[PDB]
Write a protein that binds this DNA or RNA. Structure first.
Ligand SMILES: [Ca+2]
Ligand SMILES: [Ca+2]
Length: 314
DNA sequence: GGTAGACCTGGACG
DNA sequence: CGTCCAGGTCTAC
């Protein structure tokens, strides 16, 4: 039909492909794993969400990643639009080459990698990434997803509606910095996180120089970027690392959360060697981060994603 | 300076 | 149904 979310079978002519073996990408292991919180499997094996300011539905077969876009006459995605998808999934980065390397220097990684191929990093928009992860504080993926959807619904531009779902773009800095935003977000259930969204939005616009200040962090060094980000209210070391890794092109950034701590102890028998505390603390977290970096290398954050995703899936 | 507590909430559990 | 818990951060002491 011409209504509702499309499927590969229902509207054949409206889909376009991008060569992509499942060994290079597994949507089911990437989209709902806590990187981006804006994708939903509206139909089995079909994922819909906003990508580059438009709604898309994605699904894959072996060797093929099928894409369809909802923009005025319905038509298959164009090469340019398709290029946007390629960039979002950073398809130039060869996952098979990275898995090989990680697996050669880390026998445990090699074991896990066998059962969880295709986990890669999405290249996300800084603003959406920053505010989504500010909401990740003491939160679970499902709840975070709820907060984010409600936030975009209330402050983001309306795009299109499919079935009973209305998609919204992520709110702008100006909108998030608006009056009474905190109060409205508190009614949407963000709790104390509402304060940080409002505060960080205003902080960026009225103190750091605006959007430009955030985006240029992509050209800065990880050390630089991570330090700058921690300036913002509600942004600690973990949130800052998520942003560096997922939005600021810092493939060496390694988010250290409770899950990674358990993995370090259980699968590597790791313990702090210079930090005072025995459990998670700013000293030990930093230490654990350096540990994974010295173990996996320049793309340690991407290695972290495979194990984090595999650990979720279990 | 390293570190317990407060700061919000829904889907869980014994 | 009281206590947990999930991609934490902030800061007084
Ligand atoms: Ca936690
Ligand atoms: Ca801060």
């Amino acid at each position: 039909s011409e209504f509702g979310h499309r499927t590969l079978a229902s509207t054949p002519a409206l889909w376009a492909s991008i060569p992509c073996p499942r060994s290079e990408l597994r949507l089911d292991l990437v989209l709902p794993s806590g990187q981006s919180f804006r994708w939903r499997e509206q139909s089995p094996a079909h994922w819909s969400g906003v990508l580059a300011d438009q709604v898309w539905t994605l699904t894959q077969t072996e060797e093929q990643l099928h894409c369809t876009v909802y923009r005025s006459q319905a038509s298959r995605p164009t090469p340019d639009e398709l290029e946007a998808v390629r960039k979002y999934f950073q398809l130039d980065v060869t996952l098979a080459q990275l898995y090989h390397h990680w697996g050669s220097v880390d026998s445990h990684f090699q074991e896990v990698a066998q059962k969880f191929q295709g986990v890669r990093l999405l290249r996300q928009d800084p603003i959406e990434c920053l505010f989504s992860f500010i909401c990740s504080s003491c939160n679970n993926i499902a709840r975070i997803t709820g907060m984010v959807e409600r936030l975009c619904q209330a402050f983001g531009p309306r795009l299109i509606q499919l079935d009973d779902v209305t998609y919204h773009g992520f709110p702008s800095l100006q909108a998030l910095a608006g009056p009474e935003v905190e109060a409205h977000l508190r009614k949407l259930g963000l709790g104390y996180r509402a304060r940080y969204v409002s505060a960080s939005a205003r902080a960026i616009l009225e103190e750091q120089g605006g959007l430009a200040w955030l985006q240029q962090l992509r050209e800065s060094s990880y050390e630089e970027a991570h330090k700058a980000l921690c300036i913002l209210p509600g942004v600690g070391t973990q949130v800052a690392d998520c942003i560096c890794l997922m939005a600021l092109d810092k493939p060496q950034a390694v988010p250290v959360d409770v899950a990674m701590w358990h993995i370090a102890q259980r699968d590597y028998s790791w313990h702090p060697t210079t930090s005072q505390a025995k459990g998670p603390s700013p000293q030990t977290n930093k230490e654990l981060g350096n540990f994974f970096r010295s173990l996996w290398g320049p793309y340690a954050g991407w290695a972290q994603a495979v194990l984090f995703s595999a650990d979720l899936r279990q």
